[PDB]
Design a protein around this ligand. Structure first.
Ligand code: CLA
Ligand code: CLA
Ligand code: CLA
Ligand code: CLA
Ligand code: CLA
Ligand code: CLA
Ligand code: CLA
Ligand code: CLA
Ligand code: LHG
Ligand code: BCR
Ligand code: SF4
Ligand code: SF4
Ligand code: SF4
Lengths: 63, 30, 82, 80, 732, 142, 160, 87
């Protein structure tokens, strides 16, 4: 599943720090039952200092 | 200048008003 | 004290001349801060007590102040080297 | 007392339990992450409300979330 | 079920916080447990009745103290040389100098001089003797008693009104505009015409001769025959003395404009006509909405139909009628926004156009009456904005407000906050840089090097009003404008004589210092609006914390994680903007009191030379006027300003005490109270005494509130003292 | 998992006395007893403030708060390789065993425990407070 | 204009010139006429006399305080008080805003974009600080081409 | 130090400074105090006459006080101080 590994996606999740921000997909989990399989890496950190977050494919579009 | 008996009329009418303030505060409690 | 002060003028008579050791540049109206401290001198009246300290050290001329300044610069280079 | 809620964005990184100073959080099995575990708050009546779990949660936005509600002698942190 | 009984979650709190928060969550009725719509609106309705009863029981005691311990008749004989007495003082702590020094106004003992302008008000309105004020006090005791009876009555289940009666906005607006604003201003007009105008003209009109004392020589004949100009036929002349029959006229509704030449105050015939005009227009405006009779408006369809078809406002105002009608915080925020803009319109129009007889001559009373309505208006406006924030947390539904104007405020909220931030930063760098520049040039011996900007826009507006001082000569100062020729026979002979006078406060001569402090005022309003719009629009959530709505309105923080989330809530933005309203209204009333304290003793050049730089504000206003303030009591003795000298120092206590709650924060005091609890639990003879409430430190929201309230009490008492001691001790 | 029973015969670490110990909350509300097995005689930092010589066998320490048991317990789980458990003791005599509930520490996952306080949605799918007016439920507990 | 006399014919402005030299002349009375601090006060007097003869020759408006007031409405007589040095300012301030904006675009397309802001690339900086000379033609040029503003779909927006 | 047989001795419920002496006075002194302080026992009764008796005793000497006893009942003893502007 997922759009593609190594692709550029835009986050549609409202409560994330990287909403409407360009991110790079580093891992998509193909195991069933995982709610947020797509792991997206960002060039900028959030207030917690991390750049790695998991999103569903419904919360991302290819840009 | 106002008189002595007019102060008695005001103090009773404030005490009547103080009872009606006490009655609303009981009803606002319930 | 050696160049921008009236330490010899203050040392001649210190009961009427205020201790001053800072001269400002006449640029933007701040030359009024060079006040009449006495002894034919204009500058900021200092309150650090260096003039009375040099009087207690026996300093009579500003050449001794310049020698102590360049000696302190030598010691500052020695502390940086150390 | 305090209500600690775990959401489905959790990755099972366990550091919310490790940051907990009053043993509220525990890791139960789950099927929604790679680690196959999610946090839970059974002893949420023992929660002081310090939000050390929210400081240690790497998920954006947070998976563990502490809502400061009614405060008792557990959640006030008193010894007297 | 302990105290507090309205919240079950605070009753199980074993600490002192249960005692504290139950005081502070006492009137937040919608946050209570087991709480419904009907109980919300009925408790709010009876709380309104209790508020009305408190206001009328306040006015009754402010009338009873003037009638009983005040010299209202002696002030009526000579309002220029008699200080108005508020109430007598019975203090067991006075020595003989304090009894001998507080005895003012020809009283028999130590009394307080009234700086509330109640004597000027009651004189202008028609009250003359102490018996009339006593009868008014008994009447308003009866009115407050009736409002207590009505408040108790509507909590009884027979007379409980339903929420559909409460949310009937059309009937409420029709009976508010028709009855509250129309029949009360027409009632007023009936007073001003029947009582206040003949008491200004010497005739004693009371209830015993109400039906016999005709207010006009031909009363109610020319009214119903159409010739209303008979009521403007013979106005009061310029030789008219107030309260005496000589020099007076017979016209009850004039349109003279300007001021009465002896009192420097507005004409009662003009205020009577003013009220007949804001009575006809409010009864006519109260027949607007649809209640019961087929005609009228539904405001839901007005708001639905007011959508721009280009889509620039989205859906327009669709869904806003249910948004206001369901949210009590929206209605309260709108009411407080309008109330702040009219309590400030009150303040701006009772100093420049004094409405009450001999109020312009009494200087410290005018100063108090401006500072009163500018502080009460800077707390009412901040309450409006805070209630907008509480609406956005606990009352705003994004589903019901779908792409309307209110949702589009949240759509572009970062643009509003960033542009208020730009405007505040612009005003701050420019006002601070120009004041600091003028400070440097007065410091460097060169007053001519100041950047002094003549406020030519507001001077052009003053010349548009009729001021011939600046010589712009555009309209109402030039005779070639149609507005002047339409006004020069109607109201302008009074207005131009009032505005071309230089002793009054009607549209004062402004200068570069006025420009600079008006940008200080714009800085204050813009930065207070910045913090408050930021609190209201980041109320539901933000990029730091998206779930601020699910944490309530006044939550403390969200923890040290994610960088740190101190003061993240919308209540904390209200908290930070109470300091900004205090600074704003401090600047406003500093400008008012120094522009007037130099006008009243004549030397306006002191303000014209010294207000452009902040050392003039510190030295010629804060230091110069405080000469007889802090010398109110000395080692040598004490003066009559001594209570104002203590209240000044008292303010410097309480304000600084607020710093203790605003700088030092909780866990220091929590460990301190932990050591104190150990010390009490181990001390012999004192361990026997227990606490039931566990001693804890003040909680974080409570700490910010207590420091804010101390800051505000000290701020209002330092300035109430300085302002009522630097004008009443040096009159002029 | 059978919970361990408090023996009430193991002795205390050698401690000179502290003023940070049990106040009257121990006497009327609760106090916490932490029991652990030691390899040898060591010195540990007391969570009430101070240092005590811990015994070579089992140890019993009386604490006032649950946070004092974890602050001690994580101290002797990282600095020392000592497994610990604590209890909650009430003034009527009931001892309530508290941690670890399954016998294995809550950082490690066990199949016996169940998910409670877990929401199947995220924070952004929580309901608005305007559509939950005048109800016992709130935006997160449903 | 606005009830203000010109400073060349203002009696209060000439009074401030008289009482400023007199303050400095009395400061000169306690020094030798050829002394070094007396040359500073003599240069102060000539700086004061140059200042008052410059303010009166520019058509400045002086009030009743004897102080030069600025008319910022946009008067044809008063352009150099606000309009002329405001356009001089906004050109310089837009120069600061254009070379700081163009530096961030030039370092966003780099390997480590955050190390080029603590350590500012001077050959990259100085090659666009020259380019900030013609910035109204480049700001409105980017505004007309759409490169000045970013579309709201690519802008980080806090939730409602 | 935990026992499970004496829960009060292992928690800090100690009479640290108490005494178990039954009596140290005599019968003559004890019967005098309970007779005189017998109408002051009940908390609801004692709170009633202390409020009502306390309100009367501050209103009595507040009103029967003289000029030398309290300065607020002495009144002014000199000419009043006239303020500025003739007020
Ligand atoms: C405009 C004034 C005003 C109004 C209309 C109300 C209205 C109300 N308050 Mg009150 N109250 C106010 C001022 C006001 N209060 C002030 C001065 C404070 C302290 C800052 C409080 C603190 C307070 C507490 C702590 C509580 C209330 C409660 C109540 C109810 C009245 C019951 C009561 O106190 O017995 C009246 C008794 C006497 C007057 C005696 C009613 C809803 C109670 C409640 O249940 O709230 C819903 C409650 O527990 N009030
Ligand atoms: C008609 C005017 C009016 C009305 C009735 C409301 C109504 C209310 N306000 Mg509001 N408010 C207004 C104007 C008013 N306020 C003004 C003038 C201010 C500016 C100072 C505010 C600032 C304020 C804040 C921001 C808060 C309220 C809240 C509340 C609730 C009362 C809380 C309480 O018991 O406080 C009791 C207060 C005290 C005992 C402190 C008084 C001590 C004095 C200052 C000393 C209630 C919904 C609270 C709310 O809705 O919670 C979500 C809330 O957090 N208001
Ligand atoms: C003609 C009919 C009538 C009239 C007289 C009123 C009268 C009033 N209603 Mg009411 N109402 C009516 C019918 C009526 N209503 C109808 C039919 C509805 C049904 C939907 C309602 C439902 C309704 C609700 C639900 C509420 C009211 C409330 C009120 C009061 C408003 C608050 C207040 O006193 O401020 C007084 C305000 C004014 C006098 C207006 C002044 C305007 C500005 C602010 C001031 C300008 C005045 C001037 C410059 C100041 C100079 C004075 C100065 C010298 C001192 C007021 C007593 C509220 C209340 O307090 O309940 C007790 C309340 O809760 N009413
Ligand atoms: C609600 C307002 C109010 C009320 C209660 C009254 C009440 C009264 N007015 Mg009145 N008055 C008011 C408005 C008011 N006035 C206003 C609006 C005007 C200005 C035009 C006046 C000017 C006016 C005149 C000039 C006279 C009255 C008179 C009257 C009296 C009888 C009216 C009549 O015959 O019909 C009565 C005392 C008449 C009377 O006999 O008074 C002694 C009389 O001729 N009124
Ligand atoms: C002679 C003294 C001088 C100085 C020291 C200041 C100081 C300041 N001004 Mg100001 N100002 C002055 C003259 C002065 N002003 C004049 C004469 C004008 C009239 C045209 C203004 C009008 C003005 C504007 C319109 C703006 C400044 C802004 C600025 C600030 C930031 C500018 C910056 O770094 O560009 C940052 C980069 C930018 C692109 C902003 C420049 C504005 C563009 C050109 C439009 C700075 C603190 C800003 C300010 O205070 O508001 C926050 C701002 O917006 N000033
Ligand atoms: C003299 C004291 C002072 C100064 C200058 C500051 C500074 C300022 N306040 Mg304020 N404020 C103060 C005290 C003061 N405040 C206190 C006592 C509090 C109460 C807690 C606040 C709380 C605070 C908040 C809550 C907010 C402000 C904001 C700001 C800015 C207003 C915009 C502006 O004027 O930019 C002009 C800048 C200056 C005048 C500072 C000049 C310094 C020069 C450049 C040094 C060289 C600015 C940085 C607002 C902000 O930053 O948004 C833009 C904001 O929202 N203030
Ligand atoms: C955003 C900044 C801003 C704001 C809030 C204010 C605020 C105020 N100014 Mg204005 N004004 C400003 C900047 C601003 N001004 C600038 C840049 C100038 C040139 C120095 C003026 C020159 C000016 C004069 C001459 C006077 C005021 C006056 C006033 C008041 C009326 C509004 C007005 O004429 O504005 C007009 C606003 C502009 C021309 C520019 C708007 C902002 C641009 C984009 C920067 C108000 C208190 C009057 C006053 O002080 O009353 C006594 C007055 O007569 N203003
Ligand atoms: C690289 C240049 C650059 C650019 C083009 C702008 C331009 C912008 N900023 Mg600014 N700003 C910058 C630097 C920049 N800024 C830096 C370095 C800071 C930290 C001091 C900020 C802090 C900041 C604040 C606090 C605010 C803005 C805002 C603004 C807007 C209006 C200008 C203004 O308020 O005056 C400029 C404001 C300043 C505080 C002066 C900082 C400008 C410095 C001196 C330039 C440094 C550049 C250099 C290469 C390093 C505009 C979008 C406002 C906004 O939200 O948009 C409407 C606003 O509230 N900015
Ligand atoms: C020159 C003619 C300019 C016409 C340009 C206007 C134009 O471009 O229309 C744009 C917009 C009209 O948008 P609506 O969606 O209302 O109208 C759709 C249009 O297509 C008209 O059919 O008007 C404005 O924004 C109002 C501007 C005047 C603002 C008046 C303010 C009133 C203040 C209160 C009094
Ligand atoms: C957030 C929020 C809120 C609030 C807000 C606020 C608080 C605001 C404010 C605002 C304001 C407070 C405003 C005001 C305004 C006013 C105005 C805007 C005015 C104007 C005026 C005019 C325009 C007039 C005209 C004229 C003139 C000027 C002169 C001559 C005469 C005449 C009359 C013609 C609410 C509650 C809704 C809720 C939701 C949210
Ligand atoms: S708030 Fe503190 S005690 Fe409560 S669950 Fe989070 S980390 Fe544990
Ligand atoms: S810290 Fe956050 S992401 Fe990690 S297990 Fe706990 S709730 Fe899940
Ligand atoms: S408790 Fe205080 S210091 Fe800690 S995060 Fe909250 S506001 Fe900040």
């Amino acid at each position: 599943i997922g759009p593609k590994r190594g692709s550029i996606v835009k986050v549609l999740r409202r409560e994330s720090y990287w909403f409407n921000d360009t991110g790079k997909v580093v891992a998509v989990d193909q195991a069933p039952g995982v709610r947020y399989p797509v792991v997206v890496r960002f060039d900028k950190v959030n207030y917690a200092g991390v750049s790695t977050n998991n999103y569903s494919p419904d919360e991302l579009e290819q840009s | 200048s106002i008189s002595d008996s007019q102060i008695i009329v005001a103090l009773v009418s404030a005490f009547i008003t103080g009872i009606l303030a006490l009655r609303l505060g009981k009803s606002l409690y319930q | 004290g050696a160049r921008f002060s009236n330490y010899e003028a203050w040392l001649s008579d210190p009961t009427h001349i205020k201790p001053s050791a800072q001269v400002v540049w006449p640029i933007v109206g701040q030359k009024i801060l060079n006040g009449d401290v006495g002894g034919g001198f204009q500058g900021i009246q200092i309150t650090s007590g260096f003039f009375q300290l040099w009087r207690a050290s026996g300093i009579t001329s500003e050449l001794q102040l310049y020698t102590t300044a360049i000696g302190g610069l030598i010691f500052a280079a020695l502390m940086l080297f150390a | 007392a305090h209500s600690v809620k775990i959401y489905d964005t959790c990755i099972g990184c366990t550091q919310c339990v490790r940051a907990c100073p009053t043993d509220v959080l525990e890791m139960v099995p789950w099927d929604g992450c790679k680690a196959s575990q999610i946090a839970s708050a059974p002893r949420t009546e023992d929660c002081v409300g310090c939000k050390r779990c929210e400081s240690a949660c790497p998920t954006d936005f947070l998976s563990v979330r502490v809502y400061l509600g009614a405060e008792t002698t557990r959640s006030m942190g008193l010894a007297y | 079920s302990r105290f507090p009984k309205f919240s079950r979650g605070l009753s199980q709190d074993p600490t002192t916080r249960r005692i504290w928060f139950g005081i502070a969550t006492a009137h937040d009725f919608e946050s209570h447990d087991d709480m419904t719509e009907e109980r919300l609106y009925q408790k709010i309705f009876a709380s309104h009745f209790g508020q009305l009863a408190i206001i009328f029981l306040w006015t009754s005691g402010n009338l009873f103290h003037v009638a009983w311990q005040g010299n209202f008749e002696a002030w009526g004989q000579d309002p220029l040389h008699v200080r108005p007495i508020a109430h007598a003082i019975w203090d067991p702590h006075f020595g003989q100098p304090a009894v001998e020094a507080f005895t003012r106004g020809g009283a028999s003992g130590p009394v307080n001089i009234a700086y509330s302008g109640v004597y000027q008000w009651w004189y202008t309105i028609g009250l003359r003797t102490n018996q009339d004020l006593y009868g008014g006090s008994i009447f308003l005791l009866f009115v407050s008693a009736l409002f207590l009876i009505a408040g108790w009555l509507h909590l009884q289940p027979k007379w409980k009104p339903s929420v559909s009666w409460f949310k009937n906005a059309e009937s409420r607006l029709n009976h508010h505009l028709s009855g509250l604003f129309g029949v009360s201003s027409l009632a007023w007009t009936g007073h001003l015409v029947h009582v206040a105008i003949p008491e200004s003209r010497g005739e004693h009109v009371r209830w015993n001769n109400l039906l016999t004392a005709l207010p006009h020589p031909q009363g109610l004949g020319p009214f119903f025959a159409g010739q209303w100009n008979v009521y403007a036929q013979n106005p009061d002349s310029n030789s008219h003395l107030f309260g005496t029959s000589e020099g007076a006229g017979t016209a009850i509704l004039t349109f003279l404009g300007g001021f009465h030449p002896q009192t420097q105050s507005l004409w009662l015939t003009d205020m009577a006509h003013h009220h007949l005009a804001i009575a006809v227009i409010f009864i006519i405006a109260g027949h607007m909405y649809r209640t019961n009779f087929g005609i009228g408006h539904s405001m839901k369809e007005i708001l639905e139909a007011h959508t721009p078809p280009g889509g620039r406002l989205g859906r327009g105002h669709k869904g806003l009628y249910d948004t206001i009608n369901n949210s009590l915080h929206f209605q309260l925020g709108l009411a407080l926004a309008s109330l702040g803009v009219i309590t400030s319109l009150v303040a701006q129009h009772m100093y420049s156009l004094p409405p009450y007889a001999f109020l312009a001559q009494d200087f410290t009373t005018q100063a108090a009456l401006y500072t009163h309505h500018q502080y009460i208006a800077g707390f009412i406006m901040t309450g409006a904005f805070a209630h907008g924030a509480i609406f956005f947390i606990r009352d705003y539904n994004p589903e019901q407000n779908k792409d309307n104007v209110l949702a589009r405020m949240l759509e572009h909220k970062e643009a509003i906050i960033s542009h208020l931030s730009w405007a505040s930063l612009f005003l701050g760098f420019h006002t601070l840089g120009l004041y600091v520049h003028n400070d440097v040039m007065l410091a460097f011996g060169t007053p001519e090097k100041q950047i002094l900007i003549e406020p030519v826009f507001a001077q052009w507006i003053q010349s548009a009003h009729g001021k011939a001082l600046y010589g712009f000569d555009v309209l109402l100062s030039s005779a070639d404008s149609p507005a002047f020729n339409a006004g020069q026979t109607l109201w302008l002979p009074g207005w131009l004589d009032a505005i071309n006078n230089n002793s009054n406060s009607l549209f004062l001569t402004i200068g570069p210092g006025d420009f600079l402090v008006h940008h200080a005022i714009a800085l204050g309003l813009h930065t207070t609006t910045l913090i408050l719009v930021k609190g209201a629009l980041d109320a539901r959530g933000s990029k730091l914390m998206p779930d601020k709505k699910e944490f309530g309105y006044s939550f403390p923080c969200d923890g040290p994680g994610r960088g740190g989330t101190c003061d993240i809530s919308a209540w904390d933005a209200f908290y930070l903007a109470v300091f900004w309203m205090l600074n704003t209204i401090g600047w406003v009333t500093f400008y008012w009191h120094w522009k007037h304290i130099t006008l009243w003793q004549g030397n306006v050049a002191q303000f014209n030379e010294s207000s452009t730089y902040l050392m003039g504000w510190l030295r010629d206003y804060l230091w110069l006027n405080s000469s007889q303030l802090i010398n109110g009591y000395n080692p040598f003795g004490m003066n009559s300003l001594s209570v104002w000298a203590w209240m000044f120092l008292f303010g410097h206590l309480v304000w600084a005490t607020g710093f203790m709650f605003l700088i030092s924060w909780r866990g220091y005091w929590q460990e301190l109270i932990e050591t104190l609890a150990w010390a009490h639990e181990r001390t012999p003879l004192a361990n026997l005494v227990r606490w039931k409430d566990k001693p804890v430190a003040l909680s974080i929201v409570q700490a910010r509130l207590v420091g804010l309230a101390h800051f505000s009490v000290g701020y209002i008492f330092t300035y109430a003292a300085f302002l009522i001691a630097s004008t009443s001790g040096k009159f002029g | 998992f059978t919970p361990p029973t408090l023996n009430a015969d193991t002795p205390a670490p050698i401690f000179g006395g502290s003023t940070g110990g049990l106040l009257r909350k121990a006497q009327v509300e609760e106090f916490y007893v932490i029991t652990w097995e030691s390899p040898k005689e060591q010195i540990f930092e007391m969570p009430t403030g101070g240092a005590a010589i811990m015994r070579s066998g089992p140890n019993l320490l009386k604490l006032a708060r649950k946070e004092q048991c974890l602050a001690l317990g994580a101290r002797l789980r990282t600095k020392f390789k000592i497994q610990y458990q604590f209890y909650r003791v009430f003034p009527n005599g009931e001892v309530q065993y508290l941690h670890p509930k399954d016998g294995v520490y809550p950082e490690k996952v066990n199949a016996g425990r169940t998910a409670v306080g877990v929401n199947n949605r995220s924070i952004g799918q929580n309901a608005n407070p305007a559509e939950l007016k005048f109800a016992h439920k709130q935006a997160y507990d449903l | 204009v606005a009830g203000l006399t010109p400073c060349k014919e203002s009696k209060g402005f000439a009074k401030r010139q008289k009482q400023e030299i007199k303050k400095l002349e009395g400061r000169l009375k306690l020094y030798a006429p050829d002394s070094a601090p007396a040359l500073a006060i003599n240069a102060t007097i000539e700086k004061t006399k140059r200042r008052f003869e410059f303010y009166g020759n520019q058509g400045l408006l002086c009030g009743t305080d004897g102080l030069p007031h600025l008319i910022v409405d946009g008067d044809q007589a008063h352009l150099g008080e606000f309009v002329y040095p405001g356009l001089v300012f906004l050109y310089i301030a837009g120069w600061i805003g254009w070379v700081g904006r163009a530096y961030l675009i030039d370092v966003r397309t780099s390997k480590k974009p955050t190390e080029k802001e603590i350590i500012i690339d001077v050959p990259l900086a100085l090659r666009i600080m020259s380019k900030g000379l013609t910035w109204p033609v480049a700001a409105i040029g980017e505004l007309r081409s759409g490169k000045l503003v970013e579309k709201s779909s690519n802008i980080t927006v806090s939730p409602r | 130090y935990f026992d499970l047989g004496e829960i009060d001795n292992t928690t800090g419920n100690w009479d640290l400074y108490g005494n178990d002496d039954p009596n140290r006075y005599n019968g003559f002194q004890n019967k005098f105090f309970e007779t005189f302080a017998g109408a002051f026992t009940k908390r609801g009764l004692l709170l009633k006459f202390l409020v009502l008796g306390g309100a009367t005793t501050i209103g009595y000497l507040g009103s029967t006080s003289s000029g030398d006893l309290l300065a607020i009942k002495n009144g002014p003893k000199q000419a009043p101080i006239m303020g500025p502007r003739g007020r």
